[PDB]
Symmetry: C2
Subunit: 200 residues, 2 copies
């Protein structure tokens, strides 16, 4: 079972990621507490966790604000993403069983929108054999990625460019070439960042 402080966290985290609460919105704490009817005891525990995930920001006199969704935060998020997703492909090419790679191939063929992208990257991170890697990618970093993409959709020709990048990454993992797969993942993540930048 979950605690009350955890139920409030994820329901707030979903409203921020999906866009129900706009970026930069001031969080009315006694007001939002009336929406769920729970004391401020465990409520600060929820807000403090969202500040650590850099979904909210602590303003010193005023209180908590939804993150700026700015250019500097985008560079911060894709720096770590490039390093973590890169080493995930390096370990996946080393550790993914054969049957794991064909399953990764099926998911690619069928999807031939942003959740099909999640499916491809999720297996690779899972195939890396590192649970701490999954917590930082799928648990923390992918939450801020999801709310940049909702506010800034992909450009018309991106899904075709990104799909070919996926095929080359999978082919390097199947060939057990971790050095090439890490390099291809970095280019693919860097291409995703430049897409969001062109719409800021």
């Amino acid at each position: 079972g979950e605690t009350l402080s955890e139920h409030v966290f994820r329901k707030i985290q979903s409203a921020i990621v999906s866009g129900e609460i706009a970026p930069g919105s001031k969080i009315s704490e006694p007001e939002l507490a009336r929406t769920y009817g729970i004391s401020r005891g465990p409520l600060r525990e929820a807000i403090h966790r969202l500040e650590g995930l850099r979904l909210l920001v602590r303003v010193p006199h005023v209180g908590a604000r939804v993150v700026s969704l700015s250019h500097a935060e985008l560079i911060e998020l894709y720096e770590i993403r490039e390093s973590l997703e890169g080493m995930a492909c390096r370990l996946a090419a080393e550790r993914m069983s054969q049957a794991e790679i064909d399953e990764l191939r099926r998911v690619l063929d069928t999807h031939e929108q942003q959740e099909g992208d999640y499916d491809f990257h999720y297996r690779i991170i899972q195939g890396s054999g590192n649970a701490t890697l999954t917590r930082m990618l799928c648990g923390e970093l992918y939450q801020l990625v999801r709310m940049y993409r909702i506010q800034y959709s992909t450009t018309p020709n991106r899904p075709r460019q990104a799909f070919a990048e996926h095929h080359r990454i999978l082919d390097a993992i199947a060939d057990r070439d971790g050095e090439l797969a890490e390099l291809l993942m970095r280019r693919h993540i860097s291409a995703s960042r430049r897409n969001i930048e062109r719409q800021l």
Copy 2:
């Protein structure tokens, strides 16, 4: 101000890291709740966070256990550490102001034990200009590092070997060579892992 669930978390996290609670120890939940006298409402919120940090482990019928401190967990922890500390040096050589580098040089000269190591790595991660990087290194990963080193001290000749490795890393950062500094950091982190492995 902090919440009660957060006060209990850090006091438990300190007892696990320092070694007051042995690795693999079964956590008696109603018993440990009597030690602090707080209901199980916010208590599960503390245990769940420690499982995410992989300091505890959830056993399905029994409950929570202190982490195994095994060889597989050591490889998991130093995989991410190599990638994150490596890119931290790459960004630090790009972004650390001049005055930041001399300050990093002073700390090295004076310390010429495991907290002097923390001081050197802390400035570099701080100099990387990435706050999310600091949260994952100093906040989460360094907690599991601290409890491996307490249970397994350094070998007699390690501080001399590690000190020279620090001087070469700082020299690459001062020369603004991010590619070399990232490579030197990886070798230095890999050397630290092999030290702990020799005592397992």
